[PDB]
Design a protein around this ligand. Structure first.
Ligand SMILES: [Cl-]
Ligand code: NI
Ligand code: NI
Ligand code: NI
Ligand code: NI
Ligand code: NI
Ligand code: NI
Lengths: 264, 256, 250, 250, 264, 256
């Protein structure tokens, strides 16, 4: 079909309750039952010769829709561009400054907190967002207090990193060992291959890959990691492994969301 | 029978090496930009992002453009008294646009075509374009003088305005319009909403604070009867918009 | 009838606020207007029109915003511009101060097309800020921009007198108005026969490549001060009616 | 001799820049000046003095910065103020635009004491910004603020005519100068015999508690326009000499 | 003595080479030999009934001076106020916004990078600074690139958290067990008692202490942790334990600084 | 023989419960604010922070004030062409001051006395005070109308200026002065520096860009012979400053 030609993506994403496919009256009705909302947050950045530039957004989005569906949580629109400053020496990377992302998060949370949302669960696909997100939460809490927003004291934000789930790390170790690496990992590439089997990329991977975890300026990054991979053999990925990572991430983060939303 | 061949690509479904190859033949990129805001009793909160994203995909598919990820939240401050609206400040959106365009300009992109679904974004976007040009000059980005941004508003296309007037007349209105709701019904037939619509609807175009807005427009509609929308009409709006914006994109990217 | 804020005492502004909540700001720009045009053109037009509207309506007229969003003209010497982000914070500051005192109808009489997008962005920023601050009248505060050069009567007279030679910048209509206001500062300079048509505006460096003498499509040699008085009187009449329709609306 | 930037073409500014790198900005404020003082006082004084200095020196005079840092006066209706942070970004924008064109001696003729600290902060911010941007003339760019009310001759005449009744705000010297410039706008209003002495300025709410009619220590009833002309002529002479010593220094 | 009445502090702090006790010519001479600089970073925040409001700054400062002395590193002036937004419901807490701290770090690093410093080792005493600091580094790298600062590509920042040293955690476990907690910990209080034996505080500690690690708004924080402690029995601290923590932290972070400054 | 009794306390050496008790009797707090900047061939980079911090400690010790932690980096942009200078932008320092004062004002502090060692901080600090008052009003902080900030510059004390003129005459100068270097020698006798000082020193008070500053003042001095400094002179400056600022603090905190 002309409009809808990513069928695996559509099966995974168009489940549960998306904010974008709801009316304001439906959101008002939802808010009688729950004050929780899930934001998928990723990145638009290089993922080596074979990785999708959207990998982090693709992963977060797909898992978030799954968690929404499993928990009854409303799922907001995906934050597609985050803090990816160190990947800007590769073309197609888009990044905000940390200071810009903090203001974006502040704006999102303030609008929704005024409506009565108080449990904000960010399902994150990009390690580089973690620090800025946590900073943004702190900035946001102080802003809500300064505004004397009615529910300010109740408003809570948490980031859940799908790639830090214990079930996910344990499977990646079992399948890929010390070739999982830190960026353009076979686990995340596996997941993208499951969501978008039509976009599986064929490209050579140099047989030696730069290792280590050191990340400074964009210019330094590309010198250290010339093809953009850190330590990783994404050629071990399969869409079958991808489904496994999807199912583990959704199960573990459904429990995590429910523990969050049900906590005081 | 027919085949389906897509000219362009989603940035998100491309590798850095595919982007590099692309920049050898073109310096253009399309961004769909919408909004997450109330659209009345029957309208999707995502309407403007859905319309932008679908049209932008169609234009990419007909022209060869790389299409970037959808900017899903925009300048919707006057809609914040209805739950589910998310808005950036204008000042925040200026810095987001500045950040997007600076990163891609450094890579050699120079023609940024924003396909917009929300009239509230227009002023802030144009302001962002001016701010960005001056920033690119300040940083002495190698291609700064060649970098061009344009906003194309699907709902201002002459063929769209004309078809809306034929189909809906004075019941098109200004917000939660049957033409935009019709497009969302075509795109997502299984998300078509049923709710009551009061027969009298507040008219006029005056928009100030969020709290004033909800008093003037109690259900969220401005002048509109989105109950007139059909997915069949939707397909006509899609086609008209994609044609016109495909020609617009190509006229822009090939201009000096 | 009308008063310049600058020529009023605070006690007079207090007395004014018992009878009206409206204030007019002239907003222009400091930018090149071709070989014969004044760098202050947009400020001059806006200031003079706003004074006349004040006189006709009894409105209080604030001080002229002389520097606006003119970034695309900075490749010509004498241009002064704010960043859009700066002008947003300027407008937010102006309106917050005056909203706190009781003003709630802000009518910006604008002389520069480059300001419009940034002003509309500034309005939206300002409404959310007044709500954040819980300013007493926040919900009633309204801002409107009125562009003298988009008045129906002004556009019509421009089209009748100059046709396609009006163009988009350094226009004979605005130059005519400035000749009327400052007959001592009427400029004579060469005007190359060739002038770029089209409306494309990007970086400042690109703008001067496209529009080498600073004009966009215009023949400002057609301007006379007699035409200038007609534009003045027309803009004052139409924006006097616009101001009153605004301040009396709900 | 001197030219208003607003009444010049870009070609005239280009010709000017072959002979001089200097520009004068009048900077004032929009704020209460007691029962008899004009809200535009500081702008009016600065604008008029700067015009006269331009005439005497051949300097180009930029458009008047009409709204400055007047936050402590916002409990009185009609005050307009920028935040210091906003005024910093305004000055940075002005000077960056003009430095790029070749201007390198920026002489700010100031009418409001409240601006001084923010202007000096703005200068320092601006120098670092021009260095960050590697603007061609960055190292040569200099800004100076000249406060007409701190001119030695002005202070002296004020002390001779008014003594201790000069005070610190809504002063007879500044009011005299405004009567001279706008004889049509001379105000009459009651002036309570009691007026607070002392110089303490904190929040806007505290300021109006301390200075209930807006005056600080002043008897502006002493002002005449004849005194106003003396202050005008003195400020023009001293700041004409100050401008020339500035533009000719290394 | 009248001017100098904190003698243990002075013995620990006035060693090695402090930037503040150097001329510009001495700094120029230093830069021929090394491009590294240590910043102590702490916080000004409540530390329970018995903890010093300066604890995080006191700890970072004292350890940084020790590391400077052991390594030959120049030690910059202490960043006394950081990101402590969640402690503001207790009087005497001072905090920056994350966005403000990012600009502070950007300004410090830009000035020093222009002079030729390229290895910035932040010895941190406050967990709440970590996210904002990492964000600030990223913002700073992109700023240095935008400025085309001569050494931009070489400039590296790292944060080293004294309380996350493996030798420190291992001693705290051995001495305090599960009464170490997360805030106003006996380990950090022990360290302050060693640096400032004259400022040892006597105050009652409620025998039950709120546990858990959840931190949201300042208002929520004080409800959760009424005396300001998280999980901790700082009454187990002694100045003798303090010396041990000081010596372990200096040894481990001297190795960490040397590994950092000597790395490519 | 003599005893030493200190009236006030360092905020850093106090508990939150001691601060609460203190706020029952006083709403005053002192901040030492200095700078990290070159001070010529013989001057400490920390001079302004050292002088502020020592004087502020002395004032606390004589008056009962709580003294906050030293603001060690200030507005020193014109000193950045000499290595070891650290400066905030004025705009950054405004937000730092705003953040400090907002947090402490919410706790009930209302008299903020800044003991300053660097003339370059004065303009930015005064600007910060105005910005902060407006911010406190915007936030409707309970004590906003009572919050007062003052800057006291030790080097502008009448008794300090007078003693400097007696001791050093026209060789005091404007930067890296013998009076400030003398105070640092008294405070830190073991950090006294020996380096050559050219007998001719550039005079005048003109300060613009950092690069201009180094051309005008090649060794960093403005008009000064800091070789005249002794720690004995230092003690006199310390004593004079602490007396005058102790009276200043008490006059401020007890004023309406
Ligand atoms: Cl982190
Ligand atoms: Ni990834
Ligand atoms: Ni819409
Ligand atoms: Ni014009
Ligand atoms: Ni005045
Ligand atoms: Ni701690
Ligand atoms: Ni000094």
């Amino acid at each position: 079909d002309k409009i809808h030609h990513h069928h695996h993506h559509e099966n995974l994403y168009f489940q549960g309750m998306l904010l974008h496919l709801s009316t304001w009256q439906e959101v008002e009705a939802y808010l009688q039952q729950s004050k929780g909302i899930i934001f998928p947050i990723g990145s638009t950045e290089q993922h080596g010769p074979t990785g999708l530039i959207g990998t982090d957004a693709i992963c977060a989005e797909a898992i978030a829709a799954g968690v929404g569906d499993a928990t009854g949580a409303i799922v907001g629109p995906t934050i597609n561009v985050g803090m990816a400053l160190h990947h800007t020496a590769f073309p197609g990377t888009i990044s905000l400054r940390p200071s810009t992302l903090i203001q974006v998060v502040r704006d999102y949370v303030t609008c929704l907190a005024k409506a009565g949302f108080s449990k904000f669960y960010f399902i994150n696909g990009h390690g580089g967002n973690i620090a800025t997100l946590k900073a943004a939460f702190s900035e946001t809490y102080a802003h809500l207090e300064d505004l004397q927003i009615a529910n300010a004291q109740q408003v809570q934000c948490q980031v859940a990193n799908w790639f830090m789930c214990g079930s996910v790390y344990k499977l990646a170790k079992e399948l890929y060992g010390d070739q999982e690496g830190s960026h353009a990992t076979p686990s995340e590439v596996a997941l993208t291959q499951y969501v978008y089997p039509e976009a599986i990329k064929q490209a050579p991977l140099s047989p030696e890959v730069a290792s280590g975890h050191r990340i400074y300026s964009a210019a330094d990054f590309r010198v250290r990691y010339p093809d953009g991979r850190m330590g990783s053999n994404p050629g071990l990925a399969t869409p079958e492994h991808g489904k496994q990572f999807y199912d583990l991430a959704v199960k573990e983060l459904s429990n995590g969301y429910l523990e969050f939303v049900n906590a005081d």
